[PDB]
Amino acid sequence: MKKYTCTVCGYIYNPEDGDPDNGVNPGTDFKDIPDDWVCPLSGVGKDQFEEVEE
Amino acid sequence: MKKYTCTVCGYIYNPEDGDPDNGVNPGTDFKDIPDDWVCPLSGVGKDQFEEVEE
Amino acid sequence: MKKYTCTVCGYIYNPEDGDPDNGVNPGTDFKDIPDDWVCPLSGVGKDQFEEVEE
Ligand SMILES: [Fe+3]
Ligand SMILES: [Fe+3]
Ligand SMILES: [Fe+3]
Structure with a gap:
């Protein structure tokens, strides 16, 4: 699965880790x-994220 | 997939659109x-909905 | 599916029933x-539960 990054703040969503607290x-x-x-x-929505392409 | 309607207020749940804000x-x-x-x-629960049959 | 029990309070999660209100x-x-x-x-987290083994 691909990693996604928040383009506002640089947070990386990693599908292996999830975001279990939320x-x-x-x-x-x-x-x-x-x-x-x-x-x-x-605190911004999913629409400000983009795929991390390698 | 079938559409469902709220029998209290007439709102239609359309599976193609979802309800992304919630x-x-x-x-x-x-x-x-x-x-x-x-x-x-x-604001009523799922138990007040019924299938829209065609 | 297996049942899980809260080791703090004894609540049993039964997969047939779920927990629909939450x-x-x-x-x-x-x-x-x-x-x-x-x-x-x-009110404790999933990490205090364990499988009910038969
Ligand atoms: Fe961010
Ligand atoms: Fe309604
Ligand atoms: Fe408990």
């Missing part, structure tokens, strides 16, 4: 995170 | 919406 | 419950 378990692809989730650091 | 992504069948979700307009 | 539908395996869910009786 209900997003390990192994969750970014597209499957509920659409009301926000960046843990900056 | 965490229900596009493509979510009504049976899979978490059971604590409520109608966005009237 | 958004966990019937048929949800414990591993798939969002990781910010807490025991309905004692």
Whole structure:
């Protein structure tokens, strides 16, 4: 699965880790995170994230 | 997937659109919406909805 | 699916029933419950639960 980065604050969503404190378990692809989730650091929505392409 | 309507207020849940502001992504069948979700307009529970049959 | 028990208060999570008032539908395996869910009786996290083995 791909990593996504918040373009406002640089936080990286890593699908291996998830975001368990906000209900997003390990192994969750970014597209499957509920659409009301926000960046843990900056508080902005999913629409300010983009794929980390290698 | 089928559309469901709130029988209290007439809101239509359309699975193609979801209800993304409340965490229900596009493509979510009504049976899979978490059971604590409520109608966005009237605030009533899933048990007041019924299938829109054609 | 296996039942899990809260080791703090003895609550039993039964996957057939779920915990629908807190958004966990019937048929949800414990591993798939969002990781910010807490025991309905004692308020403690998933890390204080263990499998009920028969
Ligand atoms: Fe951010
Ligand atoms: Fe309604
Ligand atoms: Fe408990």
